[PDB]
Amino acid sequence: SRGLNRVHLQCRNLQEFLGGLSPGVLDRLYGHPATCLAVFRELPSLAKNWVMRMLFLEQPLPQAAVALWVKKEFSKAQEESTGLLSGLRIWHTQLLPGGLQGLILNPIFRQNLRIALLGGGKAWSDDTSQLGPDKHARDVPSLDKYAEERWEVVLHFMVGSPSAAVSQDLAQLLSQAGLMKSTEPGEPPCITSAGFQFLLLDTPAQLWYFMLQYLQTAQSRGMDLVEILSFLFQLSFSTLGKDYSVEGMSDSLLNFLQHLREFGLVFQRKRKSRRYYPTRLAINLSSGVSGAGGTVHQPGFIVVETNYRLYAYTESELQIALIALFSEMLYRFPNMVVAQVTRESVQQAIASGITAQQIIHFLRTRAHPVMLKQTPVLPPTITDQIRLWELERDRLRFTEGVLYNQFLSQVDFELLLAHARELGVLVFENSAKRLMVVTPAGHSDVKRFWKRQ
Amino acid sequence: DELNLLVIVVDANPIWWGKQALKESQFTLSKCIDAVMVLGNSHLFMNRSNKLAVIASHIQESRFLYPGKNGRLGDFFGDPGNPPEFNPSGSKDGKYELLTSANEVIVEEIKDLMTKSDIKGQHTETLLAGSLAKALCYIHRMNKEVKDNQEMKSRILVIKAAEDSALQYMNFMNVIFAAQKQNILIDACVLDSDSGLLQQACDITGGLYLKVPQMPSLLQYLLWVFLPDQDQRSQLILPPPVHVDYRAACFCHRNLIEIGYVCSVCLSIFCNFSPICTTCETAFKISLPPVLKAK
Amino acid sequence: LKDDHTSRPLWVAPDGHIFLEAFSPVYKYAQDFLVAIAEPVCRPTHVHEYKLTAYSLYAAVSVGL
Amino acid sequence: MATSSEEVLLIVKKVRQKKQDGALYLMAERIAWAPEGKDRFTISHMYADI
Amino acid sequence: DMKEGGIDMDAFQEREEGHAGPDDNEEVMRALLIHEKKTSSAMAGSVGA
Amino acid sequence: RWEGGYERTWEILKEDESGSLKATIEDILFKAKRKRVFEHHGQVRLGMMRHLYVVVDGSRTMEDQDLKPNRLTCTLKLLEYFVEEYFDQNPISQIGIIVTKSKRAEKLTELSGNPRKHITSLKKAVDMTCHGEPSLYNSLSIAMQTLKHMPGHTSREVLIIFSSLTTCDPSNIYDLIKTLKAAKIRVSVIGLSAEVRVCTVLARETGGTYHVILDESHYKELLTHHVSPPPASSSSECSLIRMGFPQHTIASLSDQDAKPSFSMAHLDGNTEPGLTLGGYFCPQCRAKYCELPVECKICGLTLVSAPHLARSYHHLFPLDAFQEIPLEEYNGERFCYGCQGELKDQHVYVCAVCQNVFCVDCDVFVHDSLHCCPGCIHKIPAPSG
Amino acid sequence: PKFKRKANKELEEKNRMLQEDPVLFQLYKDLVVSQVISAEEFWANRLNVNATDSSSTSNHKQDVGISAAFLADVRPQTDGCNGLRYNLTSDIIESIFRTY
Amino acid sequence: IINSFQSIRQEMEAYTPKLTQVLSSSAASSTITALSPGGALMQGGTQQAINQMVPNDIQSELKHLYVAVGELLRHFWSCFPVNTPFLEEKVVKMKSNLER
Ligand SMILES: [Zn+2]
Ligand SMILES: [Zn+2]
Ligand SMILES: [Zn+2]
Ligand SMILES: [Zn+2]
């Protein structure tokens, strides 16, 4: 993985991003709309059952009640939830409030935990975004086309803008997460190695990371306003606000609203005001970790006979610019016979990255054609040929460094090897010829240790 | 991704709950609805794609509190898995929108049941055996549709509050074996009345016969022990171990069977002191009563 | 999109060749291509990709239609 | 010798049999003409009916 | 995933409470004479007829 | 002269799209589905105890390519479901496994009521070689000698399942019919393909039935009918005394590991040692052992309790479904008594006692597990209370 | 190859079941020979499920049938020639007595 | 019933106040307290390995003989007052078991 492991699982990315935030921002995060998200995104039952324990108990409990609640045949699963206890960063171990090592949760989060489960009040039904009492009365299939257009524009920036001329700043945004790579001889950015896998599963889990990308700056942006705004589209459809958000807003709320609309999770009316309605893709974000859909017959079907892998053709306007972005295949006279002489076109794209797991994922999981009709394994004997093409780019290495030669003793060269290894500037060592490669970044420090020993 | 279901059997008895308030009690009939308000919300907090099912137990029938049998929740189901024709309340389930509507049906359905209790027919007690006969027919209808892709892991919750009546206790055992085929779990939550038939549903299927001491301490024994997830119940250990043991004795006889024999060839287990028939129209040879009567 | 039988055509090309059925040749479709191949030279019929069909030279000493 | 007819006879691969160069296996107490790389036996006999 | 799992085991049915017999030539003939000397008449069973 | 007919044959076979316009393959499907036969046979017996000796064929004919290329794994695998279902509805009764190979009848398992012993024993027969030459007189005469020790009060039927071989008569089985009748035993024969007339008369004189399996789905339905006892009534088999009524214990007080558990070494239950959590005990002997309804070794009788032992036999007794009534006015409450909602697609089933309307999901559960009607609790105990 | 022909005097009483099994014979010497119980108690409930099935294989002559259970195996047995064929351990010449 | 029905209609009576929440937490403290007394946890079965090596066959075979002889004693218990299946030979057998 090159930057997508934290996207498949949502409960792991939220705990990692929470550890590197400001203490004043985390205080405002502990609200009533955030209580239904730190538990629903989880999966194990042990990490979810401890939330109800800290709600009824008013006094801190020691660790003796925890080591006994596992009875005798359950402490093995207790160590798995130990690392997760520090991920949410909501508990606190005291000294001895009534026994030994008393565990207590932040009372700021405990107050808002009962509002969204048992107790209530009034401010919860007054603020917008989190509520917004408004029904839907607009053509639903007419708005589904705008949800696909928001994601199609992103595809143009990954290729090089073949026919788009919008002013959306989306090329630099995806470059921070390692998805888009800036072209060195030119100026339109291309795509990285991890960007190919995003155009395969087509899951709305990646759009959740794009919303928290602007918050990573930690300058003048708060999380309490983003968390209360992201809860709008999480309630599927029939969750609006008419014009209640217009009266209660500011300059910071309008900035995050324009960026979320361009992602493909919510649709906004003209003039960037009036009534807003979330898209259809936001339903799959709260359902599971992935999803499928978009076809009813699946006309595509590959070949499992030869080795050039005849890719599928004739589908829609999505697979036309998608295969050319992978490795730029070829086409003949009829209905665009793609991938017919794959021998040199694949090696052109592998020279800029080790894109080996994305081609196999696109060859095996493209529309589920062979695994439903046929029975044996989809790839024949190409699993070894693909690995051979990746090893061809390992025959050389373009890196700089300095070499030290002509020593005197053998036991003296072994001491110098530990100097470059601890600092992290050592690449390759040789005890038979007394040779060591040192990167130029730490060249001014290795020469000092040799003059003293 | 994953859905669950919890069938709560509430023993709404106006006779028992009507006399408990006289003994200076703070958990009466008005507070019994609060148990569903908490258990119904904590079940949806772990997963917003769950379903709620509450069945009452009245002295005349087993009225469905949620969904009701009227023209609102009878023909059209207000389940979260039906986006069409139900979305002003089934859209904001993540707080107090759909959860409040789930409890509102119980309050609306109980209106017709409380007013239809003139008690003019002397006393008939609560037909507790007829409550479980309706829960199996409801979990089987939803399982046939959800059997694809999903699995829907559910349980059965029983809350006992009174004794039985003149009903045949054999009908209470038919729902036990009919539930073992579907690999389901049956629970029991007694309050004051104790019976030996409800405990059998926890030993055959592998449930738990929990005894509730005081009434206000009810939210503790229905959230951790009676958890619909049933994933960590094997190593939970919270209620005290079962000490007493009640099973079944004779059918139509006033004695505790332990070595007795039936009437003849039927199934009415009686005693060993029977040379001929008893309450049937069969016969029996005299090749064994002369042997058993001697010693 | 209607029925499975009302599909898999021939895929005409501006050059002069078509792509018939070759995914599931089974026994029924294995005899339909025998007449189509009775006009050009014999392309690799028993394959899985696409069967090639033309019209040159051989359309004489083949069948009698 | 242990008076038990031990030592399995020599096994010879690829032997013709009327334009069929199959495989004749010589086991312990019976002969078996195994048809190439298979599990059954075409010509099945013993060390008695010969 | 998988890639060469292991064995299913599922072993059961065990006994072996001791030795199976130190001898079976001289002591066997000793017990045969005891059964023949004891059996001298008839009238056995559980009273049939 | 091959091309003279092969060229004209392809012209007709190519125009196969014209046959799809006619509704031939569609009109038959709707008419073949409405063919609902109704032959309700009163298969029920008051006798609760049953002794069965299932005969499993192990000849060379158990490898034919019929329902599957490996018939040997078709009978052994589906027999495990019959054993598990037998103890589910009749735990107090027990069965037996007797194989036949090499012209011999070797009895595998004994007469015990251990469900785990009979299921795990069938997996060992996979490596068993299939020689051939099955013998029916050998596997039937031995089963009668062991069954003779049982007292006369049960059906003591015998089940025989073979590969439907062409008359599996060793040497005149008709002479044995006059002997099997004196033992008051019954023989059940199940066929798989060809008809067997030499065993049809045996199943009629002794008392049983004869059916031939036609598909994989038909073999599971026939085993369900054999779960119920055979319908009969005799006079010389109606005497029994001393029934064992054990009680369930836990052999602990608060913790299982703090106590010496159950079924250990020094405990008298040395039949099935190991590490369990509880079991039964005889009320007249205080002998603790396995909780499986098996015959004890201190009294001489099986365990017939009441909660989940004798009730399973009575749970299968009410075998009845519901009737139907057509109408052309669309009326009848349309509110289900169990699941409220219906289907509203010409499906109206009423009861013969309380008259309740059910759907397609409730009627199946009645004839399969419920075995009665929920309305019989809110109507029948009503006037008596 | 060769074969073995058993030459030992056989019996018909129930004592043959204990002699053929040296493991089962050890139990008869610990209860009856050790004068701890009576000989009638051992042949009642302790040893009843084994002596019943073992009583059928004491006079079983290969196969009882002749029309189906044995006719399919009588073909390779009615070939009494020379060449190199030899008899087996079991009574192979008994089939001739039933036919001639 | 009508008096108690009025308190059910008002949903605000059991919405904001949580009187049963405080008393429910007190039962969880007494539950863990009662589970603490248990020093015999994971220690009551430390003599399960030596119990199958020291007796081996002396006590294992003697234990199985008590239930084997005792099985025929119950069958003979009912054969005394009937005076039809009784045998005078088994009288000495009963006295031999008591003295042993
Ligand atoms: Zn009767
Ligand atoms: Zn006993
Ligand atoms: Zn229904
Ligand atoms: Zn009814």
The DSSP code sequence of chain B is ---EEEEEEE---HHHHHHHGGG--S--HHHHHHHHHHHHHHHHHH-TT-EEEEEE--SS---EEES-SSTTTSSS---TT--TT--SSTT-TTTTSHHHHHHHHHHHHHHHHHHS----S------THHHHHHHHHHHHHHHHHHTSS---EEEEEEB--S---SS-THHHHHHHHHHHTTT--B-EEESS---TTTTHHHHHTT--EEE--SSSTTSSTTTTTT-TT-SSSTT---SPPP--------SSSSS--SS--BSSSSS-B--S--SS-SSSS----SSSHHHHTT-
Residue A132 token pair: 């917004």
Residue B97 burial (CB count, 10 A) = 18
Q: Answer whether A416's CB lies under 8 Å from A451's CB.
A: no
Contacts of E49 (CB under 8 A, 6+ apart): none
Q: Answer whether F296's CB lies under 8 Å from F277's CB.
A: no
* Closest to A154 in 3D by CA, of A133, A132, A137, A177: A177
State the best of H11, H12, H16 to mutate against chain A, taking most chain A CBs within 10 Å.
Answer: H16
CA quadruple B211, B213, B215, B220: dihedral positive or negative?
A: negative
CA quadruple H31, H36, H42, H43: dihedral positive or negative?
A: negative
Query: Helices in A302-341 by DSSP H: which ranges?
Result: 320-326
C-alpha distances out from residue C3 to C8, C54, F295, Å: 11, 28, 63
Q: Answer whether B54's CB lies under 8 Å from B65's CB.
A: yes
| Ligand 1: centre distance to CA B285 (Å) | 14
CA atoms within 13 A on the CB side of A128: 15
Q: CB–CB of H57 and E47 under 8 A?
A: no
Whether chain F has a CB inside 8 Å of the CB on C12: the answer is: no
What is the rounded CA–CA span in Å between residue G66 and residue B188? Answer: 65
Residue A293 token pair: 């859909």
DSSP H80: S
Whether chain H has a CB inside 8 Å of the CB on F297: the answer is: yes
What is the rounded CA–CA span in Å between residue A6 and residue F256? Answer: 43
* Closest to H4 in 3D by CA, of B26, B17, B217, B116: B17
| Ligand 1: centre distance to CA B279 (Å) | 7
Subunit partners of chain D (3 or more CB pairs within 8 A): G
Q: Answer whether F314's CB lies under 8 Å from F253's CB.
A: no
Environment of ion ligand 4 (residues, CB < 5 A):
F 351, 353-354, 373, 375-376
Q: Do the two chains A and B touch, given a threshold of 8 Å on CB pairs and at least 3 pairs?
A: yes
Give the largest CA-CA distance in chain C.
40
What is the rounded CA–CA span in Å between residue F346 and residue F334? Answer: 11
DSSP A268: E
Q: Which amino acid is at A25?
A: V
Whether chain F has a CB inside 8 Å of the CB on B74: the answer is: yes
What is the rounded CA–CA span in Å between residue F291 and residue F249? Answer: 9
C-alpha distances out from residue H73 to A301, B201, F298, H91, H97, Å: 79, 38, 9, 12, 11
- Helix, strand, coil fractions of chain H, as percent rounded to 5: 60, 0, 40
Give the largest CA-CA distance in chain A.
87
Query: Helices in chain F by DSSP H: which ranges?
Result: 3-14, 24-33, 72-89, 115-123, 136-147, 174-180, 200-205, 216-225, 310-315, 360-365
**Residue count (chain H):** 100
What is the rounded CA–CA span in Å between residue B211 and residue B188? Answer: 9
Q: What is the phi-psi region of residue C19: left when phi exceeds 0, alpha when psi lies from -120 to 50, beta otherwise?
A: beta
**Residue count (chain F):** 385
Which of H71, H72, H100 is opposite residue G36, by nearest beta carbon?
H100
Long-range contacts of the stretch F194-200 (C-beta < 8 A, 24+):
F194/F164, F194/F165, F194/F166, F195/F164, F196/F164, F196/F165, F196/F167, F196/F168, F197/F167, F198/F167, F198/F168, F198/F169, F198/F173, F198/F174, F199/F160, F199/F168
Q: CB–CB of C32 and F10 under 8 A?
A: yes
- Residue B64 sits at φ, ψ, to 5 deg, of -85, 110
- Residue F9 sits at φ, ψ, to 5 deg, of -70, -35
**Terminal CA-CA length for chain C:** 34
Instruction: Name every residue in A having a CB less than 8 A away from some CB of B.
Output: 32, 36, 39-40, 45-46, 48-49, 52, 56, 70-71, 73-74, 116-118, 120, 124, 131, 135-136, 231, 234-239, 286-289
C-alpha distances out from residue B195 to B10, B124, B169, B210, Å: 16, 18, 11, 12
Angle, alpha carbons C37-C40-C42 (nearest 5°):
60
What is the rounded CA–CA span in Å between residue B132 and residue B130? Answer: 6
C-alpha distances out from residue B261 to B268, F192, F286, F312, Å: 9, 42, 20, 18
Q: Answer whether C23's CB lies under 8 Å from A300's CB.
A: no
**Terminal CA-CA length for chain B:** 67
Q: Answer whether G67's CB lies under 8 Å from F121's CB.
A: no
Residue A126 burial (CB count, 10 A) = 11
Residue H18 token pair: 């949580």
What is the rounded CA–CA span in Å between residue B103 and residue B34? Answer: 9
Contacts of F176 (CB under 8 A, 6+ apart): F137, F140, F141
Angle, alpha carbons B132-B136-B138 (nearest 5°):
115
DSSP F247: -
DSSP F127: S
DSSP code per residue over H35-55: HS--TTTTTTTTTSSGGGTSS
Long-range contacts of the stretch F35-41 (C-beta < 8 A, 24+):
F41/F231
What is the rounded CA–CA span in Å between residue B118 and residue G34? Answer: 82
Taking the C-alpha atoms of C40, C43, C49 and C50 in order, what is their torsion angle to the nearest 10 degrees? Answer: 0
* Closest to G26 in 3D by CA, of G47, G7, G53: G47
Angle, alpha carbons A151-A315-A351 (nearest 5°):
65
Strands F157-161 and F54-57: parallel
Q: Give contacts of E17 with chain H, Cβ < 8 Å.
A: 56-57, 60-61
Q: CB–CB of H2 and B110 under 8 A?
A: no
* Closest to H14 in 3D by CA, of B67, A118, B17, B8: A118
| Ligand 1: centre distance to CA A203 (Å) | 68
**Paired strand residues for F211:** F190
Whether chain E has a CB inside 8 Å of the CB on G33: the answer is: yes
Tokens 């055979």 -> residue: F230
Contacts of B179 (CB under 8 A, 6+ apart): B136, B156, B186, B205, F369
* Closest to B160 in 3D by CA, of B120, B187, B122: B187
**Paired strand residues for B154:** B5
Q: H/E element holding G33?
A: none
Strands C52-53 and C18-19: antiparallel
**Displacement of CA F324 from its chain's centroid (Å):** 29
Strands D25-26 and D31-33: antiparallel
Contacts of D23 (CB under 8 A, 6+ apart): D13, D14, D15, D33, D34, D35, D36
Residue B217 token pair: 């301490």
What is the rounded CA–CA span in Å between residue B194 and residue B198? Answer: 9
| Ligand 3: centre distance to CA F381 (Å) | 23
Q: Do the two chains C and G touch, given a threshold of 8 Å on CB pairs and at least 3 pairs?
A: no
Q: Give contacts of F17 with chain C, Cβ < 8 Å.
A: 5
DSSP code per residue over A51-120: HHHHHH--S-EETHHHHHHT-SS-HHHHTTTHHHHHHHT-EEE-S-SSSSSEEEE-HHHHHHHHHTTT--
Q: Give contacts of H72 with chain G, Cβ < 8 Å.
A: 41, 44-45
What is the rounded CA–CA span in Å between residue F63 and residue B274? Answer: 55
Nearest Cα of chain A lies from the Cα of B207 at a distance, in angstroms, of: 19
Contacts of A341 (CB under 8 A, 6+ apart): A308, A330
Strands A91-93 and F54-57: unpaired
Residue F41 token pair: 């046979």
Angle, alpha carbons B118-B119-B121 (nearest 5°):
115
Q: CB–CB of E47 and H60 under 8 A?
A: no
**Displacement of CA G9 from its chain's centroid (Å):** 13
Chains A, H: CB contacts within 8 A come to: 22
* Closest to B263 in 3D by CA, of B248, B249, B279: B279
Strands B4-10 and B51-56: parallel
Query: Helices in F190-235 by DSSP H: which ranges?
Result: 200-205, 216-225
Instruction: Name every residue in E having a CB less than 8 A away from some CB of H.
Output: 17-18, 46-47
State the best of H61, H63, H67 to mutate against chain F, taking most chain F CBs within 10 Å.
Answer: H67
| Ligand 3: centre distance to CA F115 (Å) | 35
**Residue count (chain E):** 49
| Ligand 3: centre distance to CA B163 (Å) | 28
Q: Answer whether A237's CB lies under 8 Å from A283's CB.
A: yes
What is the rounded CA–CA span in Å between residue F325 and residue H81? Answer: 64
Residue B101 token pair: 């509507």
Q: CB–CB of H69 and G44 under 8 A?
A: no
Strands F323-324 and A276-278: unpaired
Residue H41 token pair: 């946890």
Contacts of B39 (CB under 8 A, 6+ apart): B6, B8, B222, B223
- Strands annotated E in chain F: 54-57, 97-100, 157-161, 186-191, 210-212, 280-281, 288-289, 323-324, 349-350
Q: Which amino acid is at F157?
A: E
* Closest to F280 in 3D by CA, of F308, F312, F256, F315: F308
**Paired strand residues for F281:** F288
Q: CB–CB of A45 and B94 under 8 A?
A: no
Ligand nearest to the CA of F284: 2
Q: Answer whether A233's CB lies under 8 Å from A278's CB.
A: yes
Q: CB–CB of H71 and F298 under 8 A?
A: yes
State the best of C15, C20, C23 to mutate against chain A, taking most chain A CBs within 10 Å.
Answer: C23
Nearest Cα of chain D lies from the Cα of G21 at a distance, in angstroms, of: 25
Strands A435-438 and B4-10: unpaired
- Residue F336 sits at φ, ψ, to 5 deg, of -70, 145
Q: Give contacts of A301 with chain C, Cβ < 8 Å.
A: 23
Closest-approach residue (CA) in chain D for G82? D49
Strands A102-105 and A61-62: antiparallel
